[PDB]
Subunit: 171 residues, 8 copies
């Protein structure tokens, strides 16, 4: 049921089969992030011929439906897919007694507390890991990573959301 | 017995021989994971002409047969293969007294405890390596790596599955 | 509310669909910042056919509308988008007790204190992290990062602007 | 007499001279491992026109014979060779008092104990190197690397096989 | 009002839209610095058809005006822009108690004292940072970086010029 | 006197001038070892049109003459050269008190003790460098590197052969 | 006053506009130093059609005029420029108490003592930096770097020439 | 007067203007060392159409003369140059109290003792640098690097030759 939704600053990548002039307007060498479609602060992106596409708050399939229908005015029965070349809009903050603290992007793949620990290089040996602070939507909560690995208990793990702060205090 | 099954977030790579417009819509320079077909949360990926293809829970051979049969409506006798450009959906967590703790992808190649330990940069000197905790499907066991390398004992080794947690405690 | 506005020294990337002679005058291999359009000190960049375009103080959508309308004199119904290949004009300075002190670009994505700290390799152990100095428009405040990660407090966090200095003193 | 045999998960690379549409269906830039033919768990790979090719347990020349004959139905007198782009199926495990322990792939080139030491960064100074444990096919054996280099004696060296574990105990 | 002016040794990059034989005479792969126009010691560069172009002391727009007018003899209504591929002519020297001392190029983007600190890896902890020496045009001056970050005072910061030496003495 | 002879596992690179379909069947981007012709355990490599070519025990000039003569049946006066893209078959083992111990390939260029020591990152400070053990064809000698660098003595230096072990003991 | 003059071993890069067969005989991917024209010990380089060109002791503008005039016999009004892909012929030696001692190329850009010191990773803490030895044309001087960075003194700085040795002694 | 002469194992690079089928038989992407002409132990290389070219003992211009004349039988007035893509045949050995000891290739650029020190990372502080051993053609000699930099005396520096050993003893 986990569904990512595009936010401002994301870079989207639109594939139009049989139309490399649309899929790769700047050639095949540059990465999709360096050639993709920037989402503007008002939530729209420009796509050729169809104009502005409202994409903030929408899923990839919903954007796909939107773009495919409007491109049919200019392209015969267009075959289009949409994904994100750069997840720049949404992010969680993992700080404290993890090896490599910092921001972690919210993407189409779910980011749980456990998932976030690893991308942060893992806990340090002075981590108060039975006592981790999760701040979600102005609420606070205490999390125990010790029981997640010693007892395999998933009832302490949580899914991370845009803006969440995960703080591992020193001991 | 072991077979990988596609999950949401995986990036698939579809090769259609004699059809570079299908195999490489964005050109041939970018990597297959930067141009491949994302698997959506509903378990489908979009493919041109044939539309949405349900790939979650299916094997690569099954997806290939599915895509090949439906693509035959648009291409005469299509020659298709499918593999995975990015294993993003399923994963096991290796933590504790290994030199490189963290997240390890579940792929088409089997991943055993011995594979995961070796892939984690090896054990540390302070690893309780006769007493490793494996959490699988909400049920913990005790695993002894010592006997696996000193006594040739495979009967403590295990194949790892999605969601599994392998914890190597200190001593 | 937040919107980036182009400044002198920025390198812009203009995509004109169906016109690779405009999108990639130097070919498709070099990066967009190594081939993009420099913004001159008078606030203009040169664009072919239409000449000098005033871009400083304008948003990307406004520059796009400007270029599209003037390019229509030379191209029938031109499909144009503009983004930034290099954010060279505006910047905030993060110094003091962070692991990576220095210069951080102001871009189309908002940069908050929490973003800048996380982007600076994190605080150090000797950071006076309840007493961080923010200089904005010639007026200093006191900022407490401690409460932001221990108490969920966003009311001390701030969005950073061009010229801002964030100083994290020792303790 | 040493002969490698393909296993599941290997990635094979098929060269068909005069037919780049077969040799490089995804272009010339991506590596052969990222464009090659995956061996499925049932031991088969897909090859265009001829269908499924049973390759597990077979040598490269035997696969070459198989593919060449069947491609003759679709290609005039095909000139085909086959090699492995990725040795993913078979592996030996070298752990203990070697500098860089871990898995080493079994390939078409013989891997002896001495060959395996080097890819593992060599022995450490605390290696009980006169007393190395080799586990092969459920048998154990003691190996002396000291005599291999001090006395040049090859009667302690051994050829490593899929699944073998080579453990160098601390002293 | 800050304006860079080309000096000898700079490498310039001239873009002539619709004329890749002029923009990329050595192809699209090599960087603009490795294919650009060297400014000779007498202040001139060679450009095809028009001959020698006096560029030292001139701004980019002024060089653009010069080249565009003369190319009109050989190219219909040429659309030309000019930027610098390599800033090799002008430089400031930052030495002393900065982490990474050395030369910093003078470019089209203003380089202030504060800007120069960061590219030098920041100050060291033994920097006499309230007592920094700036040598500009044979004059000396004392600069306090402490007040720039503690009090946000820009009245100590300075713009750096070609040949300037910024020395941060040990304490 | 010294000449390399091809062994099983070597990857050969065959250049046929005016025939890029033969020289580069997989394109021109991939390296020659990633596209070259593998030498099989029976000592043959496959080459198009002419079939299997016996290359083990033969020199590059001999393989060239062999391939050229047989290729003349299919190509008028073929211009062919052969070299080695990967030296995988033959090798000497350098271990003990060198900064980089391990495996060193036997190639078309002679490899002497002095070459191998220098290629191994140099001796260590605790090397018994007047008493180095060379094992060649099942017969050990004593070698003094000290005299080679202090006394100009080449009469202790040796050319290394496949299977040779060079052991530098501690002191 | 300063002008570089070509020496033996330099690699020159000749651009002939509208003639990629001359500019890039080996294609456009390889670097200009890997494809450029070597200067032979007799002081000449070979150039197509016109044969050997004497380039040693001549400036780039002089070589350009020479090549352009002689190439006009084979090409109508040739547009030619020449620069240096590799500065291999002339060099100054920086040794002693600098963090990166060694060899520094003499190029078209002037190299002063202050340039060479900054390019050498900076002085060390034990450098006798008021007493640096410059050997030029067989005549040593004493140079004080201290006054150059503390007192704004350029009258101790020097331009370095081929063969010069700059020695920074300890203290 | 310093002249390099080709030896066995060198890789030569032959440029034939207007004939990319000769200059780049394997395409433009691979380096000249990976596509060049190997010199065989008998001193010859193969070049298309003309056959074997005796190159050992010859200079580049002499090889150029040889190849150019014989290619005229097959190519109208061929424009040919020759350089070395890989200096593999001749080498000097620098060991002892230099930072990075090892082999240094003898090339077309003269390698003096001073030149060899730098490529070796410079001397260590325990170098008996007033007492360096040079072994040249079975003769020994003592060299003082101290006087080369302290007194600028070139009468101790020497040109290094193939096979020379330069040993810097510990003190």
């Amino acid at each position: 049921n986990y569904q990512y939704r595009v936010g401002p600053g994301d870079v989207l990548n639109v594939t139009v089969w049989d139309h490399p002039e649309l899929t790769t307007p700047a050639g095949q060498y540059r990465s999709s992030s360096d050639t993709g479609n920037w989402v503007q602060p008002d939530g729209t992106m420009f796509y050729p011929y169809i104009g502005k596409v409202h994409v903030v708050g929408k899923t990839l399939a919903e954007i796909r439906s939107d773009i495919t229908g409007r491109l049919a005015t200019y392209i015969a029965d267009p075959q289009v897919d949409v994904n994100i070349a750069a997840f720049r809009s949404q992010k969680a903050y993992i700080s404290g007694q993890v090896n490599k603290s910092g921001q972690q992007a919210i993407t189409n793949v779910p980011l749980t507390i456990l998932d976030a620990i690893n991308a942060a290089g893992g806990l340090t040996d002075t981590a108060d890991w039975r006592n981790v602070v999760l701040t979600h939507n102005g609420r606070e909560e205490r999390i125990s990573l010790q029981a997640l690995m010693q007892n395999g208990d998933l009832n302490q793990n949580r899914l991370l959301y845009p803006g969440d702060i995960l703080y591992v205090p020193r001991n």
